[PDB]
Design a protein around this ligand. Structure first.
Ligand SMILES: [Mg+2]
Ligand SMILES: [Mg+2]
Lengths: 68, 55, 171, 104, 144, 189, 145, 75, 143
RNA sequence: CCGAUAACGAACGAGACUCUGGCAUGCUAACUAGUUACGCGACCCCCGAGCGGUCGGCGUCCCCCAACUUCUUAGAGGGACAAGUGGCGUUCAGCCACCCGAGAUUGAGCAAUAACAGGUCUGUGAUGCCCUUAGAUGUCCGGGGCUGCACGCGCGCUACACUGACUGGCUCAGCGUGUGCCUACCCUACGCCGGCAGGCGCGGGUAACCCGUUGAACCCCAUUCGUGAUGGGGAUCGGGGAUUGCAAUUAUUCCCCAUGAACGAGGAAUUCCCAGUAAGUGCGGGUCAUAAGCUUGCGUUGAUUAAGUCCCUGCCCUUUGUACACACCGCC
């Protein structure tokens, strides 16, 4: 248990998906690489958390719209 | 009194020989690494010395 | 080797010298807004820099006070003659120096200003010099047996984790 | 010459120690001196565990103060002299050098 | 017939005990610290030492010469480091010098018997805390 | 083929009760040369189900303080006891152990919190993993109590405990404790 | 050889002034005498040259008296000076080993000399308190109540 | 159950019992023979190794903390 | 099929070498071997009368395994647990004089010699003695 | 956090963070770490093995006289994200399992608004007021005391035994310290004397250079003991011998020989704990001239049970009542 995400990663995931939907895709490693230059994330441990939530949200987006 | 008994006590060792290099206290002395600093004066000056709490 | 002391004791002793020098300079130059001491040590000579708010005060008439301090720090620490140099440097953005603002607050309260006035002036000066936030506490007894603590905050202020060490200046 | 120098760098902060070693190797390589790789001595951890309280009353909490000392070795072995080629050391506060000849 | 440079060197560790198996071309012979696999103490767990050869077969080992040096931990940790180094040494040797069909058809046997022959144990220890004798046990407290 | 302790083949041992078939681990997949492995069997729930039962026995036989980590000593004790029961009964020690576990595991129990009449209020039927746990615990405690203040060694006391439990003869500590516990559940049904 | 009990086997002996059980081993059997313990018993048996594996009950009279005289005269039987009880006596200065009710009476003599000279240890023994300077605050209450 | 007072040396009535029925049952250990014939146990080990050397009993284990013997096969 | 000492059970090897030293009688044995204890933490003297031969074999084997060992190294090897009565246990060394007398007997047997540095190592005579004893005990183990 | 939604957008704390552990046969490297290969030896070999085996034997930065970083060290980069699959879920937040994987919850440190007349004036050249200040409550010196014992309590250590004790042999660590401003006091190798405690010379080490390949204990393998307050236990006490110190008595500590007390698993009650964990088991630091049954760390061996609940004990949130608000230690 204890894998619930935080506002700090969720806000960033929504924002970068909105800004760079065209650049980004549904591959985790591709997303964790594009984030490295589209955002100055101080921490790798937070960067890949953001990337994981980004992949989850984009997999959702391919099916149906969300609040973002 | 006079010269031959005022400081005549053998003080080459023990608690009484060593003292705090800061506040001249004889309790809680930290002699590791040649600190010669009090248990409390060390907590005061550890940041200046260079000791950092990591874990 | 035999004459030299081990590296561990050497670094501990160097830190000891830093602490004692800082405390002596604090007590001596407290009324001149002494911010801190930075010591550059080379194997040949020792260079020390007194970061202060008022260089014109820390160095006396014709530099009398600074050369007097140089003699003092020679005598205490056994430095050979002409092997240590004392410089005085003005602190940049003194409003961001926790020690300097605490010293000015002490000077105001010693003068006898109301703590609310003095603390709010310090808050305004810090925020005017530009900071994410600041926080002052005055605790103790004034005119009464029962002691009170008064706290004045503004802006952001982080407390926990590693970032506090190099984000928050404390005094 | 024939001379071989061992320079030891000792400090507390790895960032400045790595800088003051790397610029030494980088400077000497341009001057074409045979520089053996910077040997990393095992770091020395001075650990002091002290009661947090200044009185004695409490829940017996302890502070684990740690002081880490990092040490690097750099060997310059040129066929010709070395002292005349290297007269600057480019130090920053905190790091301490110690010159040594290979005889020692 | 005399092809040199045919040797690998593989380590295996468990609880601060590291063993280095030097797998080299030659006749079948396994020695740890200059001694054969038998007579290594404790004599209990000798089957644990022998389990690599017992499962995969003596014939496969007949083409290699194994010398293991181990300098850590305690007795059982030495045993586990030795067996892990032995089991990983020849599978790496096979991966490097023959086809990986052989490597997979040996490593599947090893992995279905016990995963620890090829995968090190990731657990080491836990620090002691200042409220009790061990890592988690706390000193007995009294109320009256 | 596996040759636990170099002998005592595993493929001839059957678990006759389906209720315990998938928790006893003497089959060929769980068969092992020695009753010793740092397998992290307490990593999560039900991980001990796939743990070999001889390993579980040698892990439960190290108890009562003076010997908590002495797995090598417990392994040699299990070795000697298995050899003794093989030469004493004439069948596989593994089959003896499996039947002992089956007969030792108390099929029921009782548990509440309210004002108990005799021992405990509500009868209940236990889980198979609880069957294995309590059977191993009862057998180990019986052997330990038998070999406390007599000349008879741990290996011999464990041996006769398993031998008596495998058939049911009212003198085994595990069987007696199971009988008492089943009786109190029956009375407090 | 572990054959049957010898005819001249005594279940209990009587050496010096106190009986010893011969059913146990000889070395651990003569330790029942006051003044002689495991180390002294083993060393006197080494000097007496008797089979250590044999029981005390099957010892014969000449071997028993040989062991007796060995343990009674250690100074003349190579036994080192640092192995005896009463080394360098506070009374006569002769190194000796005491192995009888002589031990009890030497103990009361050494207690009563301190009591007579009013030494602190003598006073403590007279009062029944601890004598080696340990704390009596929370221990030794069993001997009092 | 007060005391055992087991014998420390053999006699005529027990030595013949040891020679007649000890090599007749499968499990023979020093503890078993001690509690069976009221012998101490040092005698048990010594006499069992004597019968082992004489050949009427076969050793199987030979371990320090526990040594196990057996009767000879029949037929 | 040569045999080195490291190819056989050391526990039986040291016993066989002790028997060899006992049968070939020239090793010097101090007159107090029947009296002293082997170590400070030992409550009794060793049961075996030829503990000197056993210890001589053991120290020869250890010197074969690693050289440069002195009295301080030998006493560390043979040290063990001290129970200290009601105090909790600690670790204690052996008997310095016992180890030194044994090593002096070994060099009187002329199979142990002083090193170029401190400590002692094995002569080729001792090497050949040890390895031939190893070969014979290996043959005995085989058959 | 998601959702509901007169709220929307945030901030502190949580998280994030730093350190530590787990993986990189990938990078940079190393005579203060080494490893392979090779050369001299030393031995078993001779049946002959001969690119045979062992060597912490000596060497190949003795710098011209091999390479390499796998093992070791320490830097930068990577790697793990509920990422992949199935199931459950508003199909959201997430949860369960499995695969690949070194790892699918490694431990700590830091830590809010505040409150506790909580503890410390015996930490301080932190400090108000009071007290004393020459027959001193200053300071020094001598001795004693802090240990003192009908008794009660707390943290503990050792045991009650054969799953053991003794004797011998075999065999494995990691933290970490080490010669001093004052300051007198370091870790110890090697050889010799003694049985031990110890003593005497001769070095090395200011340290990955020496102790040290830390030959630790438990454990493992053999001997004896044999259910007996017994070869378990070593409490109490006698005698002797050493060490430190100016000084050992009220025994500092250590060693040796003697007596051998309760104790045969412990009432009512009660403590701690979920994986390298409990527990067994030793080794360092601090204290230290001498001192560990303490504490702080480290390593070795290594489990049983549980993946839940509010029954007990507490704490928190919401509703509620209030004559309390110095707030129930209230008011009256
Ligand atoms: Mg945090
Ligand atoms: Mg005594």
């Amino acid at each position: 248990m204890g894998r619930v995400r935080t506002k700090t990663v969720k806000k960033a995931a929504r924002v970068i998906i909105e800004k760079y939907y065209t650049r980004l895709g549904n591959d985790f490693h591709t997303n964790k690489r594009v984030c490295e230059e589209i955002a100055i994330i101080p921490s790798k441990k937070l960067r890949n958390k953001i990337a994981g939530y980004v992949t989850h949200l984009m997999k959702r987006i391919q099916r149906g719209p969300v609040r973002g | 009194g006079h010269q031959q008994l005022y400081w005549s006590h053998p003080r080459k060792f023990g608690q009484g020989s060593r003292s705090c290099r800061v506040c001249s206290n004889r309790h809680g002395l930290i002699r590791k690494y040649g600190l010669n600093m009090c248990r409390q004066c060390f907590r005061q000056y550890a940041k200046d010395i260079g000791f950092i709490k990591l874990d | 080797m035999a004459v030299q002391i081990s590296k561990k004791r050497k670094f501990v002793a160097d830190g000891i010298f830093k602490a004692e020098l800082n405390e002596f300079l604090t007590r001596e130059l407290a009324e001149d807004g002494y911010s801190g001491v930075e010591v550059r040590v080379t194997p040949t000579r020792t260079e020390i820099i007194i970061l202060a708010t008022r260089t014109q005060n820390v160095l006396g008439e014709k530099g009398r006070r600074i050369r007097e301090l140089t003699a003092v720090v020679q005598k205490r620490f056994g430095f050979p003659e002409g092997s240590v140099e004392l410089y005085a440097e003005k602190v940049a953005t003194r409003g961001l120096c926790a020690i300097a603002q605490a010293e000015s607050l002490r000077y105001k309260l010693l003068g006898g200003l109301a703590v609310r006035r003095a603390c709010y002036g310090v808050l305004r000066f810090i925020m005017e010099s530009g900071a994410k936030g600041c926080e002052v506490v005055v605790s103790g007894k004034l005119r009464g047996q029962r002691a009170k603590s008064m706290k004045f905050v503004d802006g952001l202020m982080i407390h926990s984790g590693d970032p506090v060490n190099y984000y928050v200046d404390t005094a | 010459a024939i001379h071989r120098i061992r320079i030891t760098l000792t400090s507390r902060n790895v960032k400045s120690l790595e800088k003051v070693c790397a610029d030494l190797i980088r400077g000497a390589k341009e001057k074409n001196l045979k520089v053996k790789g910077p040997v990393r001595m095992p770091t020395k951890t001075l650990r002091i565990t002290t009661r947090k309280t200044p009185c004695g009353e409490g829940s017996k909490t302890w502070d684990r103060f740690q002081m880490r000392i990092h040490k690097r070795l750099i060997d310059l072995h040129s066929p010709s002299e070395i002292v005349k080629q290297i007269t600057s050391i480019s130090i920053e506060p905190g790091v301490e050098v110690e010159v040594t000849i290979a005889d020692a | 017939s005399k092809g040199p440079l045919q040797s690998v060197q593989v380590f295996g560790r468990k609880k601060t005990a590291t063993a280095v198996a030097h797998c080299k071309r030659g006749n079948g012979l396994i020695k740890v610290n200059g001694r054969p696999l038998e007579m290594i103490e404790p004599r209990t767990l000798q089957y644990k030492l022998l389990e690599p050869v017992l499962l995969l077969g003596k014939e496969r080992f007949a083409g290699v010469d194994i010398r293991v040096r181990v300098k850590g931990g305690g007795h059982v940790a030495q045993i586990y480091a030795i067996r892990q180094s032995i089991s990983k040494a020849l599978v790496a040797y096979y991966q490097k010098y023959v086809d990986e069909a052989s490597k997979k058809e040996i490593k599947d046997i090893l992995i279905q018997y016990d995963r620890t022959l090829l995968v090190a144990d990731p657990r080491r220890c836990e620090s002691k805390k200042f409220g009790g004798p061990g890592a988690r046990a706390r000193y007995q407290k009294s109320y009256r | 083929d596996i040759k636990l302790f170099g002998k005592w083949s595993t493929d001839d041992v059957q678990i006759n009760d389906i209720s315990l078939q998938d928790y006893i681990a003497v089959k060929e997949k769980y068969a092992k040369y020695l009753p010793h492995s740092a397998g992290r069997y307490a990593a999560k729930r039900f991980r001990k189900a796939q743990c070999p039962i001889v390993e579980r026995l040698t892990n439960s036989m190290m108890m009562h303080g003076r010997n908590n980590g002495k797995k090598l000593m417990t392994v040699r004790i299990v070795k000697h006891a298995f050899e003794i029961i093989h030469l004493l009964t004439g069948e596989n020690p593994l089959q003896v152990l499996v039947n002992a576990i089956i007969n030792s595991g108390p099929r029921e129990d009782s548990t509440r919190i309210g004002r108990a009449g005799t021992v405990r209020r509500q009868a209940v039927d236990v889980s198979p993993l609880r069957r294995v746990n309590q059977a191993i615990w009862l057998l180990c405690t019986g052997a330990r109590e038998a070999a406390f203040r007599n000349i008879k060694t741990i290996a011999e006391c464990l041996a006769d405990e398993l031998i008596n439990a495998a058939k049911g003869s009212s003198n085994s500590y595990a069987i007696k404790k199971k009988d008492e516990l089943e009786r109190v559940a029956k009375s407090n049904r | 050889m572990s054959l049957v009990i010898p005819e001249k086997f005594q279940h209990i002996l009587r050496v010096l002034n106190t009986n010893i059980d011969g059913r146990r081993k000889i070395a651990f059997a003569i330790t029942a005498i006051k003044g002689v313990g495991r180390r002294y018993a083993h060393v006197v048996l080494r000097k007496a040259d008797i089979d250590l594996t044999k029981r005390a009950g099957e010892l014969t009279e000449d071997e028993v008296e040989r062991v007796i005289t060995i343990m009674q005269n250690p100074r003349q039987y190579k036994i080192p000076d640092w192995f005896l009880n009463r080394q360098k006596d506070v009374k006569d200065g002769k190194y000796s080993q005491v192995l009888a009710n002589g031990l009890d009476n030497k103990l009361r003599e050494d207690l009563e000399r301190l009591k007579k000279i009013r030494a602190h240890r003598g006073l403590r023994h007279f009062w029944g308190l601890r004598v080696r300077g340990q704390h009596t605050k929370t221990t030794g209450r069993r001997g009092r109540t | 159950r007060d005391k055992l007072n087991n014998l420390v040396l053999f006699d005529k009535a027990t030595y013949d019992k040891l020679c007649k029925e000890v090599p007749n049952y499968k499990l023979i250990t020093p503890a078993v023979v001690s509690e069976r014939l009221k012998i101490r146990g040092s005698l048990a080990r010594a006499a069992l190794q004597e019968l082992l050397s004489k050949g009427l009993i076969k050793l199987v284990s030979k371990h320090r903390a526990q040594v196990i013997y057996t009767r000879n096969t029949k037929g | 099929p040569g045999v080195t000492v490291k190819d056989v059970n050391q526990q039986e090897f040291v016993r066989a070498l002790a028997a060899f030293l006992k049968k070939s009688g020239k090793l010097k044995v101090p007159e107090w071997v029947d009296t002293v204890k082997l170590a400070k933490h030992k409550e009794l003297a060793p049961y075996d009368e030829n503990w000197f031969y056993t210890r001589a074999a053991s120290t020869a084997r250890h010197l074969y395994l690693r050289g440069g060992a002195g009295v301080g190294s030998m006493t560390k090897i043979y040290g063990g647990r001290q129970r200290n009565g009601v105090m909790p246990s600690h670790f204690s060394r052996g008997s310095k004089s016992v180890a030194r007398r044994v090593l002096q007997a070994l060099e009187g047997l002329k199979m142990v010699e002083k090193d170029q540095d401190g400590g002692r190592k094995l002569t080729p005579q001792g090497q050949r003695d040890l390895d031939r004893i190893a070969g014979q005990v290996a043959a005995a183990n085989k058959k």
